[PDB]
Amino acid sequence: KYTTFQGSQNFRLRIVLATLSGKPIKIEKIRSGDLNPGLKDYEVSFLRLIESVTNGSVIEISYTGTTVIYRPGIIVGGASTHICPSSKPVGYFVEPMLYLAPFSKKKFSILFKGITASHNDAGIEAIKWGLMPVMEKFGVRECALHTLKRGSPPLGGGEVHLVVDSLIAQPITMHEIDRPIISSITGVAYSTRVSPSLVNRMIDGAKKVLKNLQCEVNITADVWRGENSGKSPGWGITLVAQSKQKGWSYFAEDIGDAGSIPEELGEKVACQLLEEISKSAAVGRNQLPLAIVYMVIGKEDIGRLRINKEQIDERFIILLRDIKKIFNTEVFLKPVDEADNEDMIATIKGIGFTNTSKKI
């Protein structure tokens, strides 16, 4: 019958995995004990987004809202517009589409409207420089996220356009068993409706932490003012560590609230990135869920990805249990032969998924 899940944990992934696998699923007991049970407003909005890009899918919501049964259709994509409720930023909705965009009958051209940043969801600079490059390694040659207008919280008002021109049969098999060597650190600092000084102050803080390093540091100052700068003032930074040897990237991001000092946030995010590099082996933890999903849906072939022990946390475990419930694929881990470090190699056999929606 239906694969059953409990709670709202990994809600979007469980929906995304079902769409890729084509296996119907049921999610029940969604915030049953809460005073406000059932799906939140943005969760329903996400399901509407899934319906728009897919065709023939049947989605039902329980009369109490605490149970959802999803019968996926085929990914059809097309051109559309989505209005994102203020409860979540655009990055929340753009992220799951990346898992599905390359595998559609027609190219994804989705215009997203709403808040463009938050403390808990991917930003534009995260997606543009932190996630999309990972897809590029997996064979998505043409992918872009255009920023038409930045909308900072709480009023938002931004506009970002997702265009994934590359439609490919399935991801290439991944073979990465070495720790990439970082060549330089790059990033974009952005602000809205405020003076350029705030941007110049954060980069000063970020460079303070990172000046000790032996690699080049160049952080772009992207000051947004005028009609396209949204309705609310806001500011944040994203720092990306780049390894040109094999096109691997590591990134961290945070945004500033009212009452914060830009130099402190620049110091934190610059201090923040170093922590991720220590915890990472081949991909960053915030990149790992995308990397793992792509490998399982590859050809019927063994791909290898090097992962650090720190990356195996609670989030990682639940991802590997959810994926097994859908695809029945088991991720195997073997120690590396080296003794300088304690990394491990994740070997995954792809399920032989093929993009059958595409015209030939």
Binding site: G38, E51, I59
Partner: peptide
């Protein structure tokens, strides 16, 4: 367009 969200929530 085939299928969609059927919302029977009161």
């Amino acid at each position: 367009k085939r299928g969609g969200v059927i919302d029977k929530r009161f």
